[PDB]
Write a protein that binds this DNA or RNA. Structure first.
Ligand SMILES: [Zn+2]
Ligand SMILES: [Zn+2]
Ligand SMILES: [Zn+2]
Ligand SMILES: [Zn+2]
Ligand SMILES: [Zn+2]
Length: 169
DNA sequence: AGTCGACTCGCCCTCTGCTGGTTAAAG
DNA sequence: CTTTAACCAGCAGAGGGCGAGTCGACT
């Protein structure tokens, strides 16, 4: 109460050091979940976790329909009504509602040697991983009822094969 | 008393991934 | 001009790490 053997404390309180040890060095994780293999250092965390199974959203935006699992997602939602933009690219001074959005802007706009993503099925590369997501869903997803070639009778079940086939035509 | 350890409530940060407007090239 | 799909900010999903304030419990 307090000092740390393996870290640079971060006094002071008996738990403010014990729990620190629990988080950063002795990964205790006493409380465990119902269905998943989850367990973590605080019960507050598990109470929050169980809503991913249940679906409880006990925090309403008095101004819209939204409802969040915990308090912070609502304070973060509130910025959209207030118009507050707390975050700032230090290079261009663009403003953003959300920290991670800013980090992503910096990564795509002011960063070099950043890794891309190559589609496994087709040969095109795109920058954000999530856009590789929408590309795999729109271009290499299974189309159940099929699509017919525009100029011949051949039917295809994936949009890529369809567009590729539409040659030499 | 005086010190916990356990209980609880709250602040703020990170990583992840989908959605829809824009834009620019290819039909 | 239309059609298309990557680019981009916006925005919501889950989880981690800290501060700090009540008490009954035990020396
Ligand atoms: Zn430490
Ligand atoms: Zn669970
Ligand atoms: Zn709202
Ligand atoms: Zn910038
Ligand atoms: Zn054909």
């Amino acid at each position: 109460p307090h000092k740390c053997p393996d870290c640079d404390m971060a006094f002071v309180t008996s738990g403010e050091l014990v729990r620190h040890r629990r988080y950063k060095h002795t990964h205790e994780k006493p409380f465990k979940c119902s269905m998943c293999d989850y367990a973590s250092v605080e019960v507050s965390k598990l109470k929050r976790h169980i809503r991913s199974h249940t679906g409880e959203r006990p925090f309403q935006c008095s101004l819209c329909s939204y409802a969040s699992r915990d308090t912070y997602k609502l304070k973060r939602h509130m910025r959209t009504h207030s118009g507050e933009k707390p975050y700032e690219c230090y290079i261009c001074h663009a403003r953003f509602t959300q920290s991670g959005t800013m980090k992503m802007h910096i990564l795509q706009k002011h960063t070099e040697n950043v890794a891309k993503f190559h589609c496994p099925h087709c040969d095109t590369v795109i920058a954000r991983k999530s856009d590789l997501g929408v590309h795999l869903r729109k271009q290499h997803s299974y189309i159940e009822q099929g699509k017919k070639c525009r100029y011949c009778d051949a039917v295809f079940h994936e949009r890529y094969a369809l567009i590729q086939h539409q040659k030499s035509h």
